[PDB]
């Protein structure tokens, strides 16, 4: 990815050799048109990166919500039903399974190992048999809260109170799904990039007349700026993508798992 | 896309510029990139904002359909958790929800939903739905009738009824939101003004440049024009979210997803 | 609208510049483009942001009316699902909700809502409503009176009463929001800076463009003028979305749509 | 406002730049336009973003007060619909709400609220409230006390008590919101950055413009200065939305409207 | 510390002035117009980024306000619904205050043991310090007070709901501040950005010098002051929980909250 900076620092060299056998032909290149084009592209990059950042933020918010919902849900389970600890274990397993399964869903990885670690094989087989595993997990948690309801351990009021949290989690799932099926531009988001590329490659060809052989330095500077901003944009557009960062999601799933364990007395150890 | 018309027309004007540059002093006419830069800058800025609007709105449509999926899922989930034995009810309400999805899709797309409705629901109900001048809202009303029936039966308390009714509300905010998007577009005096200015600017910019560029104008003028037009475009696409075009929302696939999801949660 | 006038104006100013250009020499006036480029780009930016704010106001107003339709719909639906056999209260409540929509429309469009109220409600409480300084809110209080008259003696429990009350508050938030957008506008430094700032820039512009544009000059000055005037003007009507202009909200159509929906 | 006392100054800096223009090379100082175009554009952008923040702050305030009006309206409405015979509660709670509006308004305006309280409330509770360092919150507490008495009296079920408590939450969020906007101020730095960067830029501009504009320097300099200073002064009271200046929130009018409304919604 | 590299680019401007015919000998030329373009782009990017940072600051402050609000309404409900259970008022309040301080320390990455021991009995403090999220544990303990309050019939499930909603508000606050703490602005943003501003500011005089001559350092220091100030302000806003000048007075907010909860329970400091 330093390859294009390099690439045509070399166009800045070809630019100069190119500048020299010159005016026999009609080619001329001033700075003012590429300044206009460059400002326009900069503006477009500004807006675009803004949208990308907005997507990133929304993802981080949704996952934050996961953590929050699962914490409050477990808290409620402890405050309302302080004695039902096998239900605690199960429901917590389900929430943690929801988190991991979600990560694996967004990252197109296999959730099988994490599920098999957290849940009994019958319910793991069922969830993996489904094409929408995470929703099946939520459904199963719901089944647990409902079982607590028909047993008379939960009134419908407090059942409501926990159902609200499961809603929160559902909204999250849907939101992350929408953000994953995205982005919305049908690979036009790409189109701009090659516009930036062609602009950065033709730029030293237009500065050369004025900057002479300071050209590679100024051109690699400007190219660095635009290209870096573009790549930042593309990585923000794709928070759950193939070339995205492992740390957000993994730490979030670990964080919540730890939290839940700690809340349920499974932590800490005797 | 259609964008080849802008670029080749611009090439041709660029050529007219090349050949007719020698007749500028004799008419008096000469041109500076300087004023043109100002113009194209103010335009670049406007386009940016107008695309903020278009994108925001596109996104809002995606959000709404997302809310369909979420609300229906949770509604079925609640039905299972509260009334796990009422499977007939389950599949009645499911059928209405899927019908709501399809009818919504059909409405935003101006297609006859009679076939899908009669595929999901018994004929009497289809009649009730098509009798209304607002079929999708009456679909909500019929799902609401089922939930209500469950309430009067005593199977649902007013609390749990309320819990489900909230989901019906979410669905209603969806229907309204989609209708509002459908009928209220981004004021396209935006698209009017911007199209005029951008077009005139792209046809005038080989004339904004010519003297300076010569043998290298179709390449640079096309490059600039293309940038503005490929950019001016992201409105074409980000404002037909309910259209059938390749770039609009795959409402067919979304509805399929919803139906498959609600049938997955009911064992069929 | 009258943009054309101020465009024509630019054009005459432009010809003046054309005939006066090298008499700048005899007057000691030199004017290059670069400072006007700066000023014009700053103005463009500012016009960009203001326009964005306007559009936002427009969008939220629209949303508030969308919320009207949605709240009233669900409220009726709840009435038919919880109390399917009390059509009496249903027609009363619906007539109130519709009178609410029209009264609100007339309130934001400064107009007399008497006729439509009479058309939708019985004379007695049309006089009660017109007696109030805030009719729309009075209408809401009446619809609430209907629902309370449904809680009182057993048909609605507290819970389901809550379910309908919530929707009445959705509506009340709409009322408050619309009042906020209508009563408190944008702070009138808004074209109170952008009016001459933009036209003064557009009329002084050909004086600086004549140097280099020479003969082709007015075309470009009317072009730039068109752009800035047309954008500062798109703020014209997006800032008053309850206004009567073309790009303002078709509130009349929206109410019709609302009561068509409730009467179906 | 007193912005013209910066325009006259600018005209003086312009005439000084005119009379000193070609001691420039005789002093060794050269000033082209391009760096001031760059600098001016950057400043313009930053001004645009700052002014945006300011605008959004003012709007937030407006929304807050709108929420006060709404929440109080709905609270009184609920009181009349749930407890139509309890005109005592109507009276005392409405007084408490109006008192909340005024207390908040005086709190934001840094004025004494006691006259309005004595006008609206009996004195033992007024002294109670004035004794507390957070009076407004205390007024919410008291309103809550009465809704709580209605609950314990069995006139309100826990459900209905919840339905009004949600309105007290709405009001509390408002109080916390206004307190936030007032105590937490704007990040000042934007103002120290733009005040001197704009002022300095406006005064230094004619020295870089005199070269090419010559005698036309004061007009163009005072114009550009007028634009940047007018945009900066457009911000000035928006980042302080609770101020007494003419172009900020009519909190008097708003609180009069509120009291007017709550008395209209009770029959006075 | 902006004065350090203000002086530096002043010095680098002096390096440009006192000197440079070297390119003319060398063949290297540098005009303003390309640096104008680059400077405008950078200015745009700085604008957007600063805007985002500000948004983050505003989010933080908003969240803390929500702490104060949620706690207030929680105490209010506790007084209005259970006026006689005053020991519970004091305990729950001490929990809410402990929550505020522990959150402060959590965002500041400091030890909350002193403030915990100040507000809570040693057993609870020990129970809390063992948790991976002490604030969460605090919420869980307050909830246990409210839940205990539910099971001897002192609160109905509905009213227990009403308060639990406030605990959910608080938990949303916690999750959001946690997210603003763990979510740095992506480094790639300042990696490009601020280095690009420093480099732009130090290279600018070399390009301004050909047209400005001896005026270079004044225009260069002006521009550098602008860009660096704007940038620095953005830095400052991105870390709203830091001890730096432009950042949240979490101490002031915490004792404002404590004074408030003490005000509402008739108690004095
Ligand atoms: Zn446990
Ligand atoms: Zn642990
Ligand atoms: Zn939902
Ligand atoms: Zn079933
Ligand atoms: Zn609603
Ligand atoms: Zn009926
Ligand atoms: Zn001429
Ligand atoms: Zn409300
Ligand atoms: Zn009364
Ligand atoms: Zn009495
Ligand atoms: Zn709250
Ligand atoms: Zn107490
Ligand atoms: Zn929550």
Author numbering:
A (entry chain E): 24 to 293
B (entry chain A), D (entry chain D): 22 to 289
C (entry chain B): 22 to 285
E (entry chain C): 23 to 291
Question: Please, what does the article write about this entry?
Answer:
Human bestrophin1 (hBest1) is a Ca2+-activated Cl− channel essential for Cl− transport in retinal pigment epithelium (RPE). Although the structure of hBest1 is still unsolved, two Best1 homolog structures, one from bacteria Klebsiella pneumoniae (KpBest) and the other from chicken (cBest1), have been previously reported. Overall, the channel is a pentameric assembly with a single ion-conducting pathway, which varies in diameter along its length and is constrained at two narrow points: a “neck” contributed by three residues (I62/I66/F70 in KpBest and I76/F80/F84 in hBest1/cBest1) on a transmembrane helix, and an “aperture” formed by a single residue (I180 in KpBest1, I205 in hBest1, and V205 in cBest1) on a cytosolic helix. Here, by electrophysiological and structural analyses, we show that the neck and aperture in hBest1 are both indispensable Ca2+-dependent gates, and their dysregulated opening by rationally designed or patient-derived mutations causes Ca2+-independent leak and elevates Ca2+-dependent channel activity.
A patient-derived mutation of hBest1 at the aperture, I205T, was previously reported. As threonine has a shorter side chain than isoleucine, we speculated that I205T, like I205A, enlarges the opening at the aperture and enables Ca2+-independent leak activity. Notably, the threonine side chain possesses a hydrophilic hydroxyl group that is capable of forming H-bonds, which can further affect ion permeation. To test this idea, we solved the crystal structure of the equivalent KpBest I180T mutant at 3.2 Å and examined hBest1 I205T in HEK293 cells by patch clamp. Remarkably, the aperture of KpBest I180T was dilated to a size (radius 2.1 Å) bigger than dehydrated Cl− but smaller than CH3SO3−, while hBest1 I205T conducted robust Cl− current but no CH3SO3− current in the absence of Ca2+. Moreover, hBest1 I205T showed a CH3SO3− to Cl− relative permeability similar to that of hBest1 I205A and retained CH3SO3−-mediated trans effect, reaffirming the critical roles of the aperture and the neck in ion selectivity and CH3SO3−-promoted channel opening, respectively. Therefore, our results indicate that hBest1 I205T is a gain-of-function mutation due to incomplete closure of the aperture. Interestingly, asymmetry of the aperture is observed in the KpBest D179A and I180T mutants, suggesting that “breathing”, which manifests as local, asymmetric changes in the aperture region, may additionally contribute to accommodate large ions, such as CH3SO3−. While mutants with conformational changes at the aperture (e.g., KpBest I180A, I180T) or neck (e.g., cBest1 3A) do not have structural alteration at the other restriction, a mutation near the aperture (D203A and D179A in hBest1 and KpBest, respectively) impacts both gates, suggesting both independent and cooperative regulations of the two channel gates.
